[PDB]
Design a protein around this ligand. Structure first.
Ligand SMILES: N#C[C@H](C(=O)Nc1cccc(C(F)(F)F)c1)C(=S)Nc1ccccc1Cl
Ligand SMILES: N#C[C@H](C(=O)Nc1cccc(C(F)(F)F)c1)C(=S)Nc1ccccc1Cl
Lengths: 114, 114, 114
């Protein structure tokens, strides 16, 4: 699984260890070993949310399975919680797009997961 | 709805009110109040289009509904127009990918839109 | 078709002509004209893969058709091979998400491909 966050928060406000925290919490949330989890944080972005430049985030989570109605509500609570606590972004200024990928459509190590 | 534009145009060439303009235009185009619209502009990118580093853009529009054949033609005219007028990018060097997201697959404010 | 690579490799490690190399190889692999291929390389990213900040990449390939089980395996071998040779990234620290786009969902030159 892979989680990307794009945010207008500056780089200096991303705390030390944040990528390791996201890795751990996503491993636990998706039930997948941490070796399978990739994370990507992109600060200092030119963005607006609802017409305002107040801190916000646009994010995605891709996984082969482990995506669905109840799961995604749970991921949203976890991830918004982390963005609020660590980057001081209000949960109502975050979108997270969830993608249930077919194994045939995910490449890794010279092949695909199908 | 959320619009992202990635471009090799430099940051100084993006005009001051550009994010506000995209917000207002997309609110009108999707039929939603501006609270519902997020915009993200990423200049200074290392990109090629057709093998060339001439000005280009790679964009995405995600929405829960308000996506379809006719709508997407209209969005393309609107958005290519803005990118031509404001960023001086030729319409033929723009790709926009459209995504009709399921409400259960969009997280916001600690939950999802389902 | 559109190929995007996000990586923690520094910009100085991206060789001259890399975006043209990708453009050629993707044209040949997909069978689409090189003039229609867009490539976007984003270095210096704050990323982790399996909890580790060793060189890694998160990529996507979007195409209107030419996406499928065997095709994607072939693209994966090709693209991991280029990232290993040119950017010194281990194939086991690359994910590539493949997207078969409906032509009605791809904007270009003021319209869509439908
Ligand atoms: N992302 C992801 C992983 C994956 O296996 N990543 C992975 C990434 C790095 C290493 C290793 C391994 F070498 F240890 F197996 C695995 C997924 S979702 N694996 C997977 C694919 C299809 C069906 C079921 C699974 Cl667990
Ligand atoms: N993106 C987006 C929005 C959304 O509700 N965004 C939003 C984001 C922040 C605040 C507010 C509110 F205060 F206006 F309600 C709304 C979507 S598409 N809402 C929605 C979801 C499912 C079905 C129909 C709609 Cl309008």
């Amino acid at each position: 699984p892979m989680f990307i966050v794009n945010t207008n928060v500056p780089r200096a406000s991303v705390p030390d260890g944040f990528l390791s925290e996201l890795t751990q919490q996503l491993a636990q949330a998706t039930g997948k070993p941490p070796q399978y989890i990739a994370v990507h944080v992109v600060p200092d972005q030119l963005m607006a949310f609802g017409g305002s430049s107040e801190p916000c985030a646009l994010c995605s989570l891709h996984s082969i399975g482990k995506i669905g109605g109840a799961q995604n509500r749970s991921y949203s609570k976890l991830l918004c919680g982390l963005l609020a606590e660590r980057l001081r972004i209000s949960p109502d200024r975050v979108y997270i797009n969830y993608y249930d990928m077919n194994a045939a459509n995910v490449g890794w190590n010279n092949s695909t997961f199908a």
